[PDB]
Amino acid sequence: KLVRLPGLIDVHVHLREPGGTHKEDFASGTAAALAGGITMVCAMPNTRPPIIDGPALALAQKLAEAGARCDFALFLGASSENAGTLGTVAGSAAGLKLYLNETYSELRLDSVVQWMEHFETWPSHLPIVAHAEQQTVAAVLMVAQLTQRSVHICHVARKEEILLIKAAKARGLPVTCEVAPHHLFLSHDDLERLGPGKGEVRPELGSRQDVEALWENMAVIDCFASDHAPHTLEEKCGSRPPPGFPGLETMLPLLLTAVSEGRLSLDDLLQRLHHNPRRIFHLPPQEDTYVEVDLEHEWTIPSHMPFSKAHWTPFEGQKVKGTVRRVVLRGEVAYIDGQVLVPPGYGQDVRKWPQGAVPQLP
């Protein structure tokens, strides 16, 4: 007896194309998405070259249209030089991404004034998401208030951060946030097993108290999103390990396990992987699209999942209950039982659909 879910949306993925295609490309990352029950992804701009201007966006759009197997939207990235220059293309992007801390990106902004300039110049009706850890969450919230608009906080990982967001929501401030599965299902207790290289991620793995605070404050979490951040094992185990975990293929099985254990409800899951992504990012429905999952099948996560070119996973050895059996995307069987059955290029840029434009006043 399978359960039919709507097409799930991951608003935070790194697909590495252009420029890092040994780690992942549109075709492989979207195969991983489909195998994870995800039918729409929003791809981050920290590629090589980074998606920080109109020519880079145009290239990325064509690479995605040719390689993606599920539907997508592409973020633009904020830089120290592009505020005020993105107005013509802004509405074609998922939103604008700000990198406000050290992480796998060359896009760090060096002054809060640059953050203000982006909040003032990016069109006010379009999404802004921020990588903002610890006190940076409070700082970017201040910039959002000064500029009288909303912000979405990426990968919240700490008790400190979720409680700050909780306090902001209690004051009626327009802030939303997402949490990634590694910050719900891994902690410092796992760094022994992972090692210091594999274990590198931003935000770093939290304490048990951080993990427990995120679960305790589930009501504050608007979205789940994988922060699928594929790097090869050679890179993760080498001398200068880049931060990030692959996660598209493991996210849904991990969360379904938690549903089966009563840690959150099926509805809680679908708000966070479907409805809230849609409404925060103004992402359109996908016609004739659904995911069938089997909630009874118990399995152990292996040393690598089948599709991501990362070819490793930090969840190796965890027991899960829940598997994706079939994905139908826009009337076509896209995935069955370990086989992806739509080719590279089946996926489409949802921002080009009539229903995928963000509504705005004339």
Add this chain to the structure above:
Amino acid sequence: KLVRLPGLIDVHVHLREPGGTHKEDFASGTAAALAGGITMVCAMPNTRPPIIDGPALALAQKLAEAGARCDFALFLGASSENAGTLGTVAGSAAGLKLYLNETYSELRLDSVVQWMEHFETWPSHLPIVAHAEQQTVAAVLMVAQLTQRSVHICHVARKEEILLIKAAKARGLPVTCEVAPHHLFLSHDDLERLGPGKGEVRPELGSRQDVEALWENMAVIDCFASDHAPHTLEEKCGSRPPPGFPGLETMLPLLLTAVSEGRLSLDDLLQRLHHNPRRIFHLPPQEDTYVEVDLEHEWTIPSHMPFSKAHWTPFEGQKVKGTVRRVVLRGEVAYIDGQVLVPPGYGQDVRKWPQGAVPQLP
């Protein structure tokens, strides 16, 4: 220059069929919906007979399928005799409605134990909405906590009620709510003009301080919904005036005026008339469906709007800026400039669509 909006959803309408068709029927009420930019309605169960058992629901479904011009879902109503009897049909309804105070209904429950019985027996994955005023909001929230599930509060009208809900959300409790336009745009200051008969509504019109508290606490309001409650002028002006206002044709123009004045944003409006209705009630997308509005046209609300059989409106004389120009429903022109162009029966029960079933564990 028109603005394209998605198909808007009104989760609280009274269409009066069966049994009150001189006040409204499916055909006339859904024409009013379309003219108001609404493409999907959830119809309340306080009809004659009331929709409190499977035979009454079956009749109402067929009357709606034959008369509705926009899409719909039908609520079931809680009674003092039907707890534990609705399990077979529950998933075919919009949700379950509880009438917990005096209003236009014979469905009042006389004991909190009856509320508990409904919360315990209605399927836990399906929506429950409550007419719950003043302290009754706190009481039904207690019942929801005792039974470990969510509740949605209909037509919140008072500072007391919105602050209670705000406090509950700050504690992470699963409660959502809606507000009707008369509680945002009318107050005691209007009872002089309306008179005691026309002015009768439940919840009653609030003070200026109530209205200001609702605006100040917009962040707490999940949905707008009209509580379209048509009664004829003869009834409203007679000896025993029933409570309620018609509102489908005026809701969107009133709210667009507020958007134009900067009282809330277009996004704030679309969260409350599209995304949040979808996610709270698990209502499916409507393919090829959109509303085109003109935000520049200034007009004065007349003594009655064209479509509702109520043939009166409490907003007469208010100046608005914003009009519905065209509605496309599932690929067909449904409304243009004062003319409805889909016949009775074009509308469909969204709970019968594959994408319209509420997901549940096996």
